């Protein structure tokens, strides 16, 4: 409350309990590797709050979504919003199974 | 082997295989496994 910045920039997103521990300026993870990876010189906050009332319901609800597999890691700051099956062994195989 | 056994011990004795004489490409360690942590202590994966 006592300083000014250029530009600010805040991201928002739902994550799970453990996953508030793993984001942090450079981390390991499938969310700190293949879903969201700061920087490592960051400068900012990182605020989490625990919401059980807007992402919850009987009967439950599934409407969120997350990343394991990529061809490779997450660049800080870069998105891969994309829907491509991961290969495994050397099949040019486009499907689930 | 080391990832398609059953019984992987107990920690209280906890098996300790050797590797030697082989070529190391650690794709198959990777998907033998959905990973929960790598937190390597000697070299990257990336230059394993
Ligand atoms: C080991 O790999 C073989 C071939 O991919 C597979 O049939 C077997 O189920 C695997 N075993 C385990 C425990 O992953
Ligand atoms: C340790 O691993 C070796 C190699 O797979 C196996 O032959 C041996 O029986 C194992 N020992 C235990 C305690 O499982």
């Given at each position: 409350?006592?300083?000014?910045?250029?530009?600010?920039?805040?991201?928002?997103?739902?994550?799970?309990?453990?996953?508030?521990?793993?984001?942090?300026?450079?981390?390991?993870?499938?969310?700190?590797?293949?879903?969201?990876?700061?920087?490592?010189?960051?400068?900012?906050?990182?605020?989490?709050?625990?919401?059980?009332?807007?992402?919850?319901k009987?009967?439950?609800?599934?409407?969120?979504?997350?990343?394991?597999?990529?061809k490779?890691?997450?660049?800080?700051?870069?998105?891969?919003?994309?829907?491509?099956?991961?290969?495994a062994?050397?099949?040019p195989?486009?499907?689930?199974? | 082997?080391?990832?398609?056994?059953?019984?992987?011990?107990?920690?209280?004795?906890?098996?300790?295989?050797?590797?030697?004489?082989c070529?190391?490409?650690?794709?198959?360690?990777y998907?033998?496994?959905?990973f929960?942590?790598?937190?390597?202590?000697?070299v990257?994966?990336?230059?394993?």
């Amino acid at each position: 409350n006592d300083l000014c910045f250029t530009n600010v920039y805040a991201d928002s997103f739902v994550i799970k309990g453990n996953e508030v521990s793993q984001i942090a300026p450079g981390q390991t993870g499938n969310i700190a590797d293949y879903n969201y990876k700061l920087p490592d010189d960051f400068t900012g906050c990182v605020i989490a709050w625990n919401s059980n009332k807007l992402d919850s319901k009987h009967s439950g609800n599934y409407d969120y979504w997350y990343r394991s597999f990529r061809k490779s890691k997450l660049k800080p700051f870069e998105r891969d919003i994309s829907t491509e099956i991961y290969q495994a062994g050397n099949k040019p195989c486009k499907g689930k199974g | 082997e080391v990832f398609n056994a059953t019984r992987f011990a107990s920690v209280y004795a906890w098996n300790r295989t050797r590797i030697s004489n082989c070529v190391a490409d650690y794709s198959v360690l990777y998907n033998f496994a959905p990973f929960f942590a790598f937190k390597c202590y000697g070299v990257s994966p990336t230059k394993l």
